[PDB]
Every structure is written in structure tokens, then in C-alpha cells.
Amino acid sequence: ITYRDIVVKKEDGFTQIVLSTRSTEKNALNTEVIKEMVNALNSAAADDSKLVLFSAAGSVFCCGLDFGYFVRHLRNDRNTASLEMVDTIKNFVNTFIQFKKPIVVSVNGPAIGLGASILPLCDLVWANEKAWFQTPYTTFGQSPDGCSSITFPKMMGKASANEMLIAGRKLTAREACAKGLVSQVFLTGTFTQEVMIQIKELASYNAIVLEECKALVRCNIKLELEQANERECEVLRKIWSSAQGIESMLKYVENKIDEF
Amino acid sequence: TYRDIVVKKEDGFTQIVLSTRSTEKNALNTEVIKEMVNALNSAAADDSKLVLFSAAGSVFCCGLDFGYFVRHLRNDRNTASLEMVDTIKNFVNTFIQFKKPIVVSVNGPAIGLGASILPLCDLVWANEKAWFQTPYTTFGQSPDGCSSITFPKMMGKASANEMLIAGRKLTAREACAKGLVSQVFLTGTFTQEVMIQIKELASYNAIVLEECKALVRCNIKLELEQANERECEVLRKIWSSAQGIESMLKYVENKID
Amino acid sequence: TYRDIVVKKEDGFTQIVLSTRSTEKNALNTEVIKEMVNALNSAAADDSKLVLFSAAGSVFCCGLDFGYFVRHLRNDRNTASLEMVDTIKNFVNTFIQFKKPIVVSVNGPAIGLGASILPLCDLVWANEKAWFQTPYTTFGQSPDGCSSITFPKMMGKASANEMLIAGRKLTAREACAKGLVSQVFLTGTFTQEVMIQIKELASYNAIVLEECKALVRCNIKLELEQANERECEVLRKIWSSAQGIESMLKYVENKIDEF
Amino acid sequence: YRDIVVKKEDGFTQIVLSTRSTEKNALNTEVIKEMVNALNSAAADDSKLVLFSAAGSVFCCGLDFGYFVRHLRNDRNTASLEMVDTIKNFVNTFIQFKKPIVVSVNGPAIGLGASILPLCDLVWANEKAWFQTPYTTFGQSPDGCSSITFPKMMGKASANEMLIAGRKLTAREACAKGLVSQVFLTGTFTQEVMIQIKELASYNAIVLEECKALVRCNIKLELEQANERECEVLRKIWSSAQGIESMLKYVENKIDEF
Amino acid sequence: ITYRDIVVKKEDGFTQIVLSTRSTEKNALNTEVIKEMVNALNSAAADDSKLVLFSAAGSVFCCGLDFGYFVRHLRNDRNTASLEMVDTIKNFVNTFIQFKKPIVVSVNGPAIGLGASILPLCDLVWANEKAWFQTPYTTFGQSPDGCSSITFPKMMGKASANEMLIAGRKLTAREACAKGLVSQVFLTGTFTQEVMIQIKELASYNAIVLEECKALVRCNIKLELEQANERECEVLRKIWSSAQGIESMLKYVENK
Amino acid sequence: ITYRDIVVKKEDGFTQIVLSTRSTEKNALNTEVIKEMVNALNSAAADDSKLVLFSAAGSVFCCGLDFGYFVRHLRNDRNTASLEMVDTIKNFVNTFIQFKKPIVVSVNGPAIGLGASILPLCDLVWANEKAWFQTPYTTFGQSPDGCSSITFPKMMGKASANEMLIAGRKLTAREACAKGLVSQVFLTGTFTQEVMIQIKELASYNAIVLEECKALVRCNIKLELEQANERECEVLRKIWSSAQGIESMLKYVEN
């Protein structure tokens, strides 16, 4: 397949999946982009690669959900649109939870909201030093997504995780790395060649050793991730179908656009 | 009316301030614990969105008042160690069961039970001059406040044992890096800043705040409960023994602080 | 007397010092493992309040002696990998089951099994010059020592995989920031600070120390047991396979020690 | 409430399934949300326990497939999402319920009407009632956590005779298999149930609730996990062409044995 | 070692522990009786037996906790006494949980309360047809003990378990056998000789095989039992340290 | 698709595997018969049947492991042979654990040791009324196999499980049905007739539905079964490579 909003590049030993949106700005996630992503992942699961590189094109890595888009739909019909909304997010998150091959994610810029919370679901997080990370859930008017309700407290402690989850604090690549969110930081000048050279190193390893490393790590966390996803989504379906949650989303979008 | 605490009902939040009169340095006796639990029970049932837990004086909380407790253990070992353990369990569980977010503001040193309760709260705000220690092996006790699981969870077992076994102190900056503290505040503007930040938190959607806490507390709650009971059972055993009382007396007669 | 370790029964603590003769740079063969288990079983029964696990020489423990195990696998794959995997499993379980606190002293590189057993101990005291690696992808192996769960628990999944999959080395200070090491020492005063702090710990209440260990280890023990079993099950599969034998044969032959 | 009758009494609240928007106490969306509402009220009131019973000749024939297949056939995607959401939340209300629930079974319990019974605490059945979970006849995988609760009370082989083979159990054989906990004679079923409920309502409220809590304790998470997995599967079956097809076949062909 | 409330017999291949109380009626359990049992259980763990036979003398196998005894102590100081009471129960129950050899329990009279809830902790339950079984906790005014909050639902399903735990119903030996509580029912006439024949048969088996069958079975459920015992005792302590809980026990003992 | 010891029938909606040994007595299991079953199951898994029917030919179902076969091997080389034996049992048992389609088992006569202990790993168990069941591990001189150390207590309680596991108890088809080991009992005259009617009934059901019921029911117990299989095999390895274990089997075979 060729995609509207993503580019896929099949190499020997690895498959590249590049978020490069056209129907949204700065790699925002709407329904269509998400189904393309899940589609590219499913295919990458089945091809002859040993691992996947998840990267993004342009300025930001992923700004998360496109609330400007979703708020129109929930305003039009909140009970249908939040069912669909929440079902596509859950499916998205589970695609990461279920993925058998290692996923290296390569972060070129800002990762926000759902663009940030999916990161812990991959196997290696490689950040450009100029990227920063935020899950401003309380600004959005939603509770956590992407299993960040367990993965953040697990990697940074509950207090530190709540600084992101409740207080909506941003983290530089180096702060995210210290808190476990990011596993390696790269100098900006040579980011993509350095990522390219390290990815090819990983692709030269035994495929079975790679799958087994990931399988063994994934054993005693997978059911926790499944449940967090299920629990988060249930909560989001009741918030996004509520009068306050819609209003909150509206309020957020009107403010976001109101700047010079 | 409260002898050892102050309760301030503010817009969207309730402030409980530790300010002891029956103890020095905000130390915890059974009486002080009782007040805090009741204050917390009241705050949970009121129309605030969250609780700010802070303290007054040079110290945040130096933990259990062992000078007070050792006297009671020497009177009646079995009664006093049991009441002591039962009141701690209840104290700890109140934090574990609490549905509203609790922000804790630490303006000075937090020692022993004063530091182990902090992981049970939602955010930990610390003055840069605050420091942290759980010198259980100096006291002559095993962990309290669930710290036997919470410390290993935030910092890994080794770093956690540096505190639990080796009795190491952490600066607010070191604690922040180790996950005990979530934000360090500058000394000059400490109280005004904490108040600005709590008010902004109290401006957030109440349901979003509770759901968020509910989703986080969710896969840890039973472990916390199990750990609280296990911790308290070991403490009752230690504090009812001659060896345990001897340790407490050693600490009270030898301590310099 | 042991041919690969020195045991110093001391006042309130027992020292187990890895100092192999049958292997180079404190590598682990079947004999070395067996002695360690012996010493740890004896130390579990003495009236020491705690164990200090140290080493002698320039390296702490470079992990599995692959030059030793490779011909042993090349001979009798099925039984030999069972032996090999069972002796590791037992070595690892001994740490998991140990009731007394273990303080480990690291005065050089800990590589592979030499590094993955550290999270099973209680305090990790490292010379600033010590470094840490689990280069599993280079060995041709899946994780061992329960590192499949312990590493992601202390440092998070992604940071753990930098070690487990990407084969990265950590300095003492970096290992400390990531949970693996609990105290870094200056090289000049390392062994003397370690001795004075061990004796301070040996002066604490024996019951209190045993109870701190029990409560901390409590909600993680079955996870460790299950992860050990699961990892050994996979290692039997890999080391008894054509490609896993070759990977080991390739490593011990191509390897040029950076320690 | 259109479809249920609540009867608070001394020490216990009775909730009677008595549908008028459906036949034979079938569960449609309306009926389910009334039941959840009534259960939530019962949780908040001063009763020590709940009696869940039914009016008419059938206890509950489960999902009203005639009602649901109309919705599924319009919009597979949205209707299967809504449908699974309402069942999950129904089932979850039983899972989370803190007071003992005694269920009084007066007639056939079928499909979801039998799969909820193990989520209650005592099951008292008329000797003339029978039990069936004909999932393979409907064309669905199990619901109500019966994928784990049936194997747990009677072993997997016997559970699959219900779940796969579609076999009926009399009240007596359901009793031997642990699904029913007491069988009563038919003539004065309601009189005898009522005296035993009054006996149970004489017990300490805290003791009753601690007994519930200590049992539900061991199994609550497994129940939530089974509910979750089943609903995931049903979302896939009911939004598929095979699934809709199976449900229409069922609705159109052969009518009721209750 | 001599005991006042139990008789221990070291036979060839098995040890027989007989509950035969002198300080209680109907083989009721008070602190000292429980202590003597834990002691004889530890001794039998250590001896050369392949397995233990657990039985009782008299018309009643075991009527459970001696509430007359305990209520006196709880009256004095409920706080302190409920802990002591709950800790000796926990330890008793844990002694069965951790026991590594097979225990065969032989029941020739009513087993009531704690007297019945320990049976699922044993390995084989052999009962006279005239034996019956009851856990009338709601009559006592307590929540479950002996791990019965998980052992009864796991053997009979939750609804059937609650007919015992909540409704306090009695099961005949036959009914308890159909429910998995009893594993073999014997006709009354030659009950003890029949039991003795069968225990010697079991003792003929390889000791390691016997210990290994037990360890592999117990392995899957050991934590759950320990946690059940933990929760149950925590709840019993808060019931027996309350006004309501002492009232319940007072009423029960007075009515008697 | 050719087998010495089993007849496979790729039928309409279902595949029937018939145990009919020649290399052993009474459908007994040795390395080769076990390896044939595994291959035949793996093939059934891959074909377009919606379910598997596991039957046996003649008057006995399966008397379990052939100890006359195995004990010569153990005596010859206890370490190698006890490991080989334990590895093939593990893979056989795991084949049942991991199986995605329902398996109906048709039990025509006695099921003994591993012949009875695999029964709980299947989904439906239909027994001729004259069929009986035993797992006499304490007579063989071994610990449990087939996951029966967890599956027996989960279906019947721990006490009734040890009647079988420790006490050598034999269940009639009726008692086994009452204990949850058998799901249906069929009167003698009409066993094979009825089994065939009923399996055709089930093969008329939706394939995905059948596979989903199996996946949902297995879900909850999968890891426990795997851990029990691993655990049992470890202990058996120990017993079968010990003098007392070899002594036990030898005695059993001589008697």
C-alpha cells in the first residue's frame, strides 16, 4: 500500500514507518492517520524485517490527538463519535501492546499527549536533543491515554509521573531521558545518520535473539498494559460523551488557536 | 478546633497544616495522628477538589515521637505496641484509600514516618533546603508507610536500600532525581509559589483529577494495602520485644539529630 | 579452601571474594558457580548479619566462561545445555532465595551474568572506575539473571533495552543514576570506605536487617522465580540450537576483550 | 421503572425483573439500564442484601436478539460498540456489587440470563426451572464471564457441554454442577424463598458484607478480565458479516422452548 | 512429648494425631489445644513418617473455636485479646498450609466452624456416613476462617460455598462428598478399622513420591491460601475487636 | 499423513485422530507413538476442520506410558533417557495446551496414567459407560504428569484429586462425569453411533465461534498449565534418574 499520511520504507533487516501527515498539521492524529498507522504496523508485523523504525517527518514528532478535528464530531454527535473515537485509540494502543518485533522510535521534535504516551510502548526511544515531551491531560480536559497511567509511574515514580499527568509539565529530551521516557539522546546535526547507523547495527543481530529479548521482557507487563488501556478508554468514553468534557475540549481548541 | 493542626477551607481546596503542640518538631504521637486522620476524613467529604498537606516550623515532620513512645512501651509492651501499630496502619491506609489528590508541601526535614508517607501522596513539593531520611536501622525498626515497596518502586531496590538500610539522607534535589520529590521550590518565594500552584491545580476539572488519580492508584492499591499490613505486623513483633524496646531506648538516649 | 573464591568469616558479616584460578578475569564456569553456591549456603547458616560479595583482580566478573561452555555444548547439545542452564538457574535462585542482605563490592567491569545478578543483591557499591554491560545480542543469547524483569523495573523498558538489546556499557555513575548501582566511590579510597561502611551495617540489629530484606523482597520474589525459569527455558532452546551454538562459537573466537 | 419492580423491605431490597418492553424477560438496552440503576440504588440503601427475582413463567431468556439485530443490521460498527458497552457495564455492575445477591430463579434462565447467575452469591431455583447457554446456536462466544465461571464451578469439560454443545440443565442437575445452590419445590417457591431471605436479613450487616468481600476478593480481577476479553471478542463477532448473519438466522428460524 | 488434649501415635510409616480434648467439651479449640496441635504437627513433620493421620476421639470430631473460652478473654480487653486469638488461629491454619507431608483426616462425628474449614487444608478427607459438616459463621457472628473463603468456592463453586458460609447449612457426609469437602465416605460399622487398613496401604508407597505429589499440588495454591488466611484474620480481628462482634459472640455463648 | 499407530480421518467439518497402536499393547504410549500424535495434532491444527475428535480403536482408550519400553532405556542410561523421556512428555502435553481448535475425546475403555491425565487438556470428553479412569502414580512410583497436579484439583477439589493422584482410585464413567472429568456418558450399545452424530452436530457450528469459545475458556488457565507442565517434568526428571525411581518402575514392570 501507499498511504496519504505516512511513508513506509522496507529495508533489509528493518522496516521504516514515517509519520508524515497531509490531512492534519504537525503530524496530528485523526481517525484516518491512526488507521493508516495500525495498517502499516500490521503489515510490518508480517514482512521479513527483524524490527521497525518509527520516525516522523518535519518539525514536530507527533502533537497527539487533533482535538480541533474531533471536537467538531463530538459536537455533531457525542455518543456515537466518542464510541468511535475511543475504539480507534484503544485499537491503536493495543497494536503497540501486541507488537512482536522490537520497535525503535526516533523522535525528531515535540511529542505531545498521545504522541508522547505511546513512546513507552516501544522498545527504544531515540530523541533529538531539541525534542521535548508533554502529556497535558488536565489542559485537554481528559484523563491519561496510551497506558501512561501505569507506564509513567513505573519508569519515574508516581510523584514525578503526576507532574506530567496532572501538572502538565514539559520535559526536554535530556530530562525525559533521566526520567526513563527517552533511552538515548542524539546531537541534532547528525541525528538521522546516527539513528540510521545504529538501526543498521541492530538489524545485523540474530532475529530470534531479538524477538526473544522482547518476548521475555513483555511477559509480565503485557496484561497490565492491556488492562490500563481498557481502563483508560472506559474513562475517556464517559468524559468525551459528557457535557463538561466536550466543553473542555472546545475551550482548549479555541485557546490553542488564539495566539499570534 | 485542633491542638496540633490547622485546617484552612479555601476555594477548590482544603489545607491541612501540621503544627504540633504536644510534640517538638512536628513529631507524631497517637494524638497528632488522630487529628490528621479526622482532618483527612473531613476533607474527603467536603466540596474541595484536592488537599494540600503542609507544615509549620523549621521541620516538616521528624516522624514518630520515640521519646513519647518508648515510655509507653515500657509501661505495657503488648497494649502500647498494638495501639501504636494500629494507629499507624489506619494513618497509612487513610492515604491509600483517599480519592482526592493530595499535594504535600515540605518546608523542612522529613524523617522516618514523616518521609515514608510522602510516596502515598500525589505530588511532593519541596523547599530546596528540605532533606529526607528514613533511618529505620538507627531507630531499630523495619520500614513503615509502605516504603518497603514504594521506595524500591520509584528508585530500584539498591538506591531504596541506601535509604532503608544504610540510613542515607537526600537533599530535595537528590530526592527529586530519585523520585521522592516531584518539584523543588526556591527558598525566597516558597510559600507564595506553593499557593499559586495549588490554586491553579484546583482550577482543573474535578472529575478529570479524580479519574486520573483513580487510574494511577489502580494497579498499586492492593500491593500498598498488603505492604501496610505486612509492615505493621513486623513492627508489632519488633516493638513488643525486649530487643526492640532496647533499640528505641538506645536511640532516645543517644540521639543528637 | 576453595580454588576460585576466598571466604572471610568476619565479625557480624561474611566476605565472599571471587578470585578465580580455573578461569580468567573471574569468568563463571560450572566449578566457580558451585563454589559460590556452597559459600552462600554456608553464609546463610552462619551468624553473620549480612554478606559482602567482592572480587579480586582488575575485573569484577566478566560473566559466563563461554570458552569453557562452548565445547561442552558442541559435544552433547541436549544434556549439556540442560546442565549449563540448570547450574545458572540454581546460581540465580540462590540469590533470589537468600534471606540475609547481600552488599556487593564492584572494583572493575561486570559483564553479562556478572552484571545481571547485581539487582538480586541488596546494595551495590561500585568503584567510579567500574563499568557494567549485558551484551546479550553480542553473545547470541536472550537475557539471564532475571534481567528481563529487573532492568526494566529499575530503569524503565526503553533504558533497560539499551542494555539488553543495544549492548551498551554503563559507567558506575550512569549505572547509579539508572538504579543498578547504589553508591559510587572514588578509586583512591574505595576498598577502605567499603570496609568501614560494611562494619557499620554489621553493627545494626540482626532481626531488623533480616526483616528489611524480607519486606522489600516480598512482593517481587515470585516474579523473580518465574523470570529465572522462563529465561533458562529460552536459553536451553537457543544454546541447543544450530544458530545459538554458532553465535557462541563465533563470539569466543572473534572476541577481543575491552576489559 | 417500566421493566422492573423494586420492593425495599426490612433488611433487604428485592428487585423483580418484570419486562413490558420485551417478552419473557428478555434483556434489551432499556431493561439493562433499569437493572443497573436499581442495583446502584440497592448498593446505596440500608439493606443488608439484595433479592434478584422475576415475574412470569420465565426468569430471563437473555439478550433480546430480535431487538438487537435490527440495530446491528442498520449499522454494524456503531451498534456493536453500543451493544458491547451496555453488556460490559451490566456484567460489571454484578462484579462490583458489594452486598450479597440472592437470585431466585422461577423459570428458564437462558443465555445471558443464565450467565449472570454465577455473579450472584446464592442461586435458588424452582425444580421446574432449567438452564441453558446456547451460544453456538446464537452464533456468539460466551458472555457474563461464563468463559471462566462455568469451568471454575464444574470443570472445563462440563462447562463446554453448556458453552459449546448447548445442553440444557434441569434445576437439579445445575445444582449438582454448582450453578444452582438450592432447589425448591414448585407450589410455594416464592413463600419459601421469602422466609429464607428474611432469615438471612436477620444476620449482622457487616458479617454478611465481609463474607461477600472475602469471597469476591479472590476472583474479582479475573472476572473483570474475563468480561473485558469476552466483550472484545463479541465486538468482533457482532460487527462481522458472519456474526450478523448468524443472529438473523437465529431470530428468523425456530422459536422459543420457554 | 506428652499432651493433655491430643494423643500422638508414631506408627510404622505414619504418625497418628488424635484430637481428644480434656480442657474443652466436644473437642472445641482453645489457645492451649491449638498450641498442642501445632506442636504435634511440627513433630510429625520432623519424624520418619511418610504421612499423617489426623483424627479425633468422642462423639464429635471438632466443634471449632471454644467461644465460651474466647469471649471471656475478649471481654477483658478486646483490642489485645482479638489479636492474640487471631494470631493463634492464623498460625494454626498456616501450619496446615505449609505442611509438606500428606495429611489424611478421618472424621467420625460433626465437624463445625474451624473444625470443618481446616479439612480442605488436609490432603484426603475420610468421613463416617454419620458425620456432618457445618460452618455457621453467620450464627457465630464472624466472617470465614481456615481459608474457607477460597477453599469452599474452589471445590463447589461460589453459590454452593455460600450455602455454607452465609446460610450456615449442614451437609451430611454424602452431600459433603458430592461437594468435594469429603473425599471418601465409609459405612459406620467398621469405620475405624477400614480407615486403619487404608492408611497402612498408603504408607506402603514411596515417601519421596508422596511428598512430591503433595508439593506439586500445593504449589499452585499455596500463595492464595496464605493470602486468604491473611485477609480472613485481618477481618476477624476487626470484627472481634468491635462492640458488634463481642455482642454477637456474647449472644451466641449465652444462648448456649 | 501415513501413521503406524494412528488413523487420521480428515472429515467434513472435523478431523478424527484414532489411536490404534501396534508397537505397544493396549494403546500404550512410547516415544514414537507420542511423536506420531504430536505430528497428527499439528496437521489437524493446520487443516480446515473446525474441531478435532480424538478417539481410540478397540476396547481400551489408552493405558498411558509403556513402562516396559521406558525402563530398559532408564536402566541403560538414566541421565540421558530421563531427560529425553521428560522432553517428549512436555512437548506432547504442550501440544494439547497450545491447541486452538476444540478437541472432543471419545473414551471407549480404560484411560490410565497419562492416558487419563491428558483428558482435562481437551474440551469435551465423551465416555462409554463401561469406560473407567485411573492415574495410579503412586503404584508406578512417580509424581503427576499431564498437568493433573492442577487440573484435577480445579475440577474436583484437592481431596477428590488426591484420591486419584495419591490413592490409586478408579472412577467409572459415571463417577468421572460427576467429578467433571467426563462431560457425557453414553450407554454401551450405541457409543460410536452417538459420538458420530454429535460431532457432526458441532462441526455444523460457526468455525470462528468454536475457536473463540476455546480461546476464551483456555485464556484464564494457559500460563498455569504451562507452569504445571514444566514443573511436573522437572520433578519426573529427578525421579526417573534416581535409583529409587528406576527401582520403582522396574518393580512395577516385573509385577
What residues contact residue C180 under an 8 Å CB cut-off, 6+ apart? B156, B158, C115, C118, C119, C124, C132, C151, C154, C155, C170
Chains A and B touch (3+ CB pairs under 8 A): yes
Please, which chains are in contact with E (at least 3 CB pairs closer than 8 A)? B, D, F
Strand residues in E33-177 grouped as ranges (E): 51-56, 103-107, 111-112, 124-128, 132-134, 171-172
Radius of gyration over alpha carbons of chain F, in Å?
A: 17
Residue A209 and residue C142: Cβ atoms within 8 Å? Answer: yes
The Cα D179–Cα E159 span in angstroms is 7
Within 13 A of D158's CA, how many CA atoms are on the CB side?
26
Contact call for residues E168 and E136 (beta carbons, < 8 A): yes
The owner of cell 462490583 is D96
Contact call for residues D6 and D38 (beta carbons, < 8 A): yes
What residues contact residue B83 under an 8 Å CB cut-off, 6+ apart? B30, E79
Query: Which residue, A176, A143, A160, A109, is CA-closest to A245?
Result: A143
| CA-based nearest distance E80→chain B, Å | 6
F126 interaction partners in chain D (CB closer than 8 Å): none
**Joined grid coordinates for residue B27:** 513529631
Contact call for residues D16 and D190 (beta carbons, < 8 A): no
Catalytic residue among E29, E51, E65, E236: E65
Which of A144, A159, A227 has its CB closest to that of B212? A144
Q: CB-based contact (8 Å) between E234 and chain B?
A: yes
Residue A149 and residue B216: Cβ atoms within 8 Å? Answer: yes
For residue B31, list its beta bridge partners: none
Q: Are strands C50-55 and C27-28 parallel, antiparallel or unpaired?
A: unpaired
Within 13 A of E3's CA, how many CA atoms are on the CB side?
22
Amino acid at E76: N
Residue B231 and residue C212: Cβ atoms within 8 Å? Answer: no
> What's the start-to-end Cα distance of chain A, in Å?
39
The Cα D18–Cα D9 span in angstroms is 18
3-class secondary structure per residue, D23-59: CCCCECHHHHHHHHHHHHHHHHCCCCEEEEEECCCCC
Residue A258 annotated as catalytic: no
Residue C182 and residue B165: Cβ atoms within 8 Å? Answer: no
Angle (nearest 5°) at CA F194 between F190 and F199: 160
The owner of cell 479412569 is F133
C220 interaction partners in chain A (CB closer than 8 Å): none
Q: What resolution in Å is listed for this PDB structure?
A: 2.2
Q: CB-based contact (8 Å) between A156 and chain B?
A: yes
What residues contact residue A198 under an 8 Å CB cut-off, 6+ apart? A126, C166
> What's the start-to-end Cα distance of chain C, in Å?
28
Number of H helices, E strands in chain F: 12, 9
Collapsed DSSP state (helix, strand, coil) of residue E24 = coil
Q: Are strands A111-112 and C27-28 parallel, antiparallel or unpaired?
A: unpaired
Nearest CA in chain F to C225: F227
Which of C207, C216, C218 has its CB closest to that of B161? C216
Strand residues in F6-60 grouped as ranges (E): 6-10, 14-19, 51-56
For residue E126, list its beta bridge partners: E106, E184
What residues contact residue C76 under an 8 Å CB cut-off, 6+ apart? none
Query: Which residue, A155, A125, A51, is CA-closest to C152?
Result: A155
Residue F120 and residue D156: Cβ atoms within 8 Å? Answer: yes
The Cα D206–Cα D209 span in angstroms is 5
The Cα D90–Cα E130 span in angstroms is 45
Residue F102 and residue D141: Cβ atoms within 8 Å? Answer: no
Q: CB-based contact (8 Å) between A137 and chain B?
A: yes
The Cα B44–Cα B50 span in angstroms is 8
Catalytic residue among A53, A114, A124, A210: A114
Top residue of E86, E135, E162, E179 to mutate, by most chain D CBs within 10 Å, is: E162
Q: Are strands D101-105 and D49-54 parallel, antiparallel or unpaired?
A: parallel
What residues contact residue E11 under an 8 Å CB cut-off, 6+ apart? E203
Which class for D226: exposed (0-12), middle (13-18), buried (19 or more C-beta within 10 A)? buried
Query: Which residue, C20, C16, C17, is CA-closest to C3?
Result: C20
Radius of gyration over alpha carbons of chain D, in Å?
A: 17
The owner of cell 457525542 is A78
Please, which chains are in contact with A (at least 3 CB pairs closer than 8 A)? B, C, D
Other Cβ atoms closer than 10 A to F72: 12
Contact call for residues F176 and F127 (beta carbons, < 8 A): yes
**Joined grid coordinates for residue E81:** 485479646
The Cα D189–Cα D171 span in angstroms is 13
| CA-based nearest distance D197→chain E, Å | 10
The Cα A52–Cα D81 span in angstroms is 31
Contact call for residues A99 and A41 (beta carbons, < 8 A): yes
**Joined grid coordinates for residue F144:** 503427576
Residue D3 annotated as catalytic: no
Residue D176 and residue F179: Cβ atoms within 8 Å? Answer: no
The owner of cell 558442541 is C74
- Max CA-CA distance within chain E? 53
Top residue of D148, D156, D221 to mutate, by most chain F CBs within 10 Å, is: D156
The Cα B18–Cα B125 span in angstroms is 15
The Cα F236–Cα F219 span in angstroms is 27
Q: What are phi and psi of B250, to 5 degrees?
A: -55, -55
| CA-based nearest distance C57→chain B, Å | 24
Q: CB-based contact (8 Å) between B167 and chain A?
A: no
Query: Which residue, A128, A118, A108, is CA-closest to A151?
Result: A118
Angle (nearest 5°) at CA D98 between D95 and D102: 80
Contact call for residues D136 and F124 (beta carbons, < 8 A): no
**Joined grid coordinates for residue F180:** 467433571
What residues contact residue A68 under an 8 Å CB cut-off, 6+ apart? A28, A253, A256, A257
Contact call for residues D5 and D38 (beta carbons, < 8 A): no
DSSP string, E191-231: HHHHHHHHHHHHTTS-HHHHHHHHHHHHHTTHHHHHHHHHH
The Cα B193–Cα B189 span in angstroms is 6
Complete domains list, chain C, with CATH: 1-202 (3.90.226.10), 203-259 (1.10.12.10)
Please give the C-alpha separations between residue A206 and each of A49, A194, B135, C247, in angstroms, as whole numbers.
Answer: 12, 21, 48, 9
Residue B144 annotated as catalytic: yes
Nearest CA in chain C to F224: C226
The Cα C55–Cα C61 span in angstroms is 8
Q: CB-based contact (8 Å) between B233 and chain E?
A: no
Contact call for residues D210 and E237 (beta carbons, < 8 A): no
